[PDB]
Every structure is written in C-alpha cells, then in structure tokens.
Scaffold this active site. Sequence first.
Site, short mmCIF file in Angstrom:
data_model
loop_
_atom_site.label_atom_id
_atom_site.label_comp_id
_atom_site.label_asym_id
_atom_site.label_seq_id
_atom_site.Cartn_x
_atom_site.Cartn_y
_atom_site.Cartn_z
N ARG A 88 6.05 8.68 -6.90
CA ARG A 88 5.84 7.68 -7.23
C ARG A 88 5.67 6.63 -8.49
NH1 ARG A 88 2.04 4.36 -2.78
NH2 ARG A 88 2.42 6.13 -1.42
N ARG A 127 -2.65 -5.45 9.19
CA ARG A 127 -2.25 -5.12 9.66
C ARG A 127 -3.57 -4.31 10.52
NH1 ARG A 127 0.24 0.09 7.02
NH2 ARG A 127 -1.69 0.21 5.23
N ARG A 160 -7.91 -0.74 7.92
CA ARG A 160 -7.47 0.29 6.92
C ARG A 160 -8.83 -0.67 6.54
NH1 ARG A 160 -1.94 3.61 5.46
NH2 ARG A 160 -2.63 2.78 2.92
N1 LIG Z 1 2.21 9.66 -4.73
C1 LIG Z 1 1.49 9.50 -4.77
N2 LIG Z 1 0.59 9.11 -5.84
C2 LIG Z 1 -0.19 8.96 -6.08
N3 LIG Z 1 -1.17 8.50 -4.99
C3 LIG Z 1 -0.64 8.15 -4.39
C4 LIG Z 1 0.77 8.41 -3.71
N4 LIG Z 1 0.87 8.66 -2.64
C5 LIG Z 1 -0.22 7.85 -2.21
N5 LIG Z 1 -1.68 7.76 -2.76
C6 LIG Z 1 -2.58 7.10 -2.66
O1 LIG Z 1 -3.22 7.60 -1.26
C7 LIG Z 1 -2.84 6.05 -0.81
C8 LIG Z 1 -1.91 5.46 0.41
O2 LIG Z 1 -1.06 5.73 0.23
P1 LIG Z 1 -0.34 5.17 1.46
O3 LIG Z 1 -0.91 5.78 2.81
O4 LIG Z 1 1.20 5.81 1.45
O5 LIG Z 1 -0.06 3.37 1.35
P2 LIG Z 1 0.97 2.95 1.08
O6 LIG Z 1 2.59 3.89 0.24
O7 LIG Z 1 0.61 1.46 -0.41
O8 LIG Z 1 1.56 2.03 1.70
P3 LIG Z 1 0.94 1.66 3.07
O9 LIG Z 1 1.42 3.19 3.71
O10 LIG Z 1 0.59 1.09 3.89
O11 LIG Z 1 2.45 0.75 3.98
P4 LIG Z 1 4.09 1.30 4.72
O12 LIG Z 1 4.77 0.89 4.22
O13 LIG Z 1 4.10 2.94 4.97
O14 LIG Z 1 4.52 0.41 5.66
P5 LIG Z 1 4.31 0.46 7.49
O15 LIG Z 1 5.12 1.09 7.73
O16 LIG Z 1 2.95 1.36 8.03
O17 LIG Z 1 3.77 -1.05 7.65
C9 LIG Z 1 2.94 -1.65 7.47
C10 LIG Z 1 3.03 -2.92 8.52
O18 LIG Z 1 3.52 -3.36 8.50
C11 LIG Z 1 4.27 -3.34 10.04
N6 LIG Z 1 5.76 -3.28 9.80
C12 LIG Z 1 6.48 -2.39 8.99
N7 LIG Z 1 8.12 -2.57 8.68
C13 LIG Z 1 7.72 -3.87 9.52
C14 LIG Z 1 9.09 -5.25 10.29
N8 LIG Z 1 9.97 -4.93 9.98
N9 LIG Z 1 8.25 -6.19 10.03
C15 LIG Z 1 7.54 -6.56 10.41
N10 LIG Z 1 6.01 -5.69 10.63
C16 LIG Z 1 7.06 -4.19 10.19
C17 LIG Z 1 4.16 -2.12 10.11
O19 LIG Z 1 3.72 -2.26 11.72
C18 LIG Z 1 2.51 -2.67 10.01
O20 LIG Z 1 1.38 -3.58 10.16
C19 LIG Z 1 -2.17 4.90 -2.17
O21 LIG Z 1 -3.21 3.76 -2.54
C20 LIG Z 1 -2.57 5.85 -3.75
O22 LIG Z 1 -3.75 5.63 -3.23
#
Ligand SMILES: Nc1ncnc2c1ncn2[C@@H]1O[C@H](COP(=O)(O)OP(=O)(O)OP(=O)(O)OP(=O)(O)OP(=O)(O)OC[C@H]2O[C@@H](n3cnc4c(N)ncnc43)[C@H](O)[C@@H]2O)[C@@H](O)[C@H]1O
Length: 217
Positions: A88, A127, A160
């Site tokens: 990222r 969420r 969360r």
């Molecule tokens: N490489 C890295 N480098 C540095 N630090 C790092 C790192 N990787 C991690 N970190 C650290 O760790 C932390 C957490 O990382 P992480 O846990 O990876 O969080 P994120 O990337 O910010 O994103 P999310 O996991 O919350 O969402 P997502 O894209 O997976 O979507 P989801 O499918 O859940 O969907 C979300 C919601 O939307 C809903 N949803 C999904 N698709 C749809 C749709 N098509 N329509 C309607 N609702 C939908 C779901 O039901 C859900 O409720 C970071 O902030 C950082 O601190």
Amino acid sequence: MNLVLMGLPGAGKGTQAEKIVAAYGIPHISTGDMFRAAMKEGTPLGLQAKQYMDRGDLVPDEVTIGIVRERLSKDDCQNGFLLDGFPRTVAQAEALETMLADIGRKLDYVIHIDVRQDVLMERLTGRRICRNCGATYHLIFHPPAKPGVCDKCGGELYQRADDNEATVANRLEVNMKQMKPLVDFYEQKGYLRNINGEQDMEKVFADIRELLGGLAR
Ligand SMILES: Nc1ncnc2c1ncn2[C@@H]1O[C@H](COP(=O)(O)OP(=O)(O)OP(=O)(O)OP(=O)(O)OP(=O)(O)OC[C@H]2O[C@@H](n3cnc4c(N)ncnc43)[C@H](O)[C@@H]2O)[C@@H](O)[C@H]1O
Ligand SMILES: [Mg+2]
Ligand SMILES: [Zn+2]
C-alpha cells in the site's frame, strides 16, 4: 496465479477475497488481519501495530514488509496466493517485486477496486461485526435480521475500533496519498486492472472472475 487486491479502506477487498479463495482454494494473505491476530496474541508486533491501527495510520514499512516476506515463504503459497491490503506504499511494492523474485514468481494481476470516497465513508462507519463468529453486516447495505444480533450465531454485533467517523477520515487520507501512486506504478508494469467497486457484490465478483478467466485462456 499470484494476485494483489488493492483498494482504499472499505472498497470491498475482504468481501471479494473470500469469494476468490473459495473458488480457487489459494491462500488469502491480509496484512490487516495478520496485525489484528498479533494484537490478540499479545506479540511485540501486535503491540506496536495496535497504536498505528487505532489512529488509522499505516504501520511502518520495514515491519510490514517483514511479516509478508515470512508469510510468502511458506509451502502453502506454491499454487499461488491472494495478497489483500499489501502493498500500500511504493516502497512496499518495490519490496514485493524482489521478495517474489527470490522465490521464482511474478505477479499476474494487481486488481484495483475503485470506489468514491464518500461511499467508502459509508461502507466503513455502518459496518458491524459479530463478536462471536466474525460475521460481517452493514446497517445500510446488508443489515442483520434483528438489530444488534448476528443471524448465524445470535452473537453480539459491534463496530470495529477504527471504523468510527474520525478514524475513517484519517484512514482515507493516508491511504489515498500512499496507495494511489501505486496505480501508475503498476500500470507501467502492465499488471494493473481496474474494477468498478460501486456495484452489487456478485456483480463485482463477476467482473473479477471475467478478468481471471483470461489467465486460463
Ligand atoms: N500494507 C499495510 N501497510 C501498512 N499498514 C497496514 C497495511 N495493511 C494493513 N495495515 C494496517 O492495518 C490497518 C487495517 O487494515 P485493513 O484491515 O486492511 O483495513 P483496510 O484496508 O483499510 O480496509 P478494510 O479491511 O476495512 O475494508 P476492505 O476493503 O477489506 O472491505 P470489506 O470487504 O470489509 O467491505 C467493507 C464494508 O463494505 C461492505 N461491502 C463490501 N462490498 C460491498 C458492496 N459491493 N456493496 C455494499 N457493501 C459492501 C462490507 O459488508 C463491509 O461492511 C490499516 O489501517 C493499517 O493500520
Ligand atoms: Mg479488509
Ligand atoms: Zn456470529
């Protein structure tokens, strides 16, 4: 098949990753999930990542690159893998190229799931997660049968820690600055493929499966 799912927070990386691995049976590697696991275990890494995660900041590159290098070396990655949330930052991406080269691999596609920031804000704040089984719901887009209750186990739903509005705004800003330059980086290598993430879940999956089809062709 070596893939990377790239998207701003809340774009749907996990939702899609789960569908992908159920279809191909390859490991789903999520940096966020690994950091959370380390936090629960109480490991040195878990303690350090907690502070960054709680603030919506990115965990420093060296630490992150290290856990990924370790995970990618295991035998379960021989048939391919799905990286979710890594890389990222440009440096994590440079590190990944060399890391893969060391084990004789190259990325096939870097799937960029694109969604507007205003929608991402809603995706994350609404969420809700089950405290017992980890089942995910969304108060706006896909709510449980009964309020605050998990349909699968009857467990407690909660938000969360980093999903509150203030932390989400930070998460979006730092990821936009760090992650977006990766679009041009990967476009230059020919790995980048864009997916419209503002469609229903199954439709997003079909566009992905359609893309993945060109691999078997
Ligand atoms: N490489 C890295 N480098 C540095 N630090 C790092 C790192 N990787 C991690 N970190 C650290 O760790 C932390 C957490 O990382 P992480 O846990 O990876 O969080 P994120 O990337 O910010 O994103 P999310 O996991 O919350 O969402 P997502 O894209 O997976 O979507 P989801 O499918 O859940 O969907 C979300 C919601 O939307 C809903 N949803 C999904 N698709 C749809 C749709 N098509 N329509 C309607 N609702 C939908 C779901 O039901 C859900 O409720 C970071 O902030 C950082 O601190
Ligand atoms: Mg996720
Ligand atoms: Zn549950």
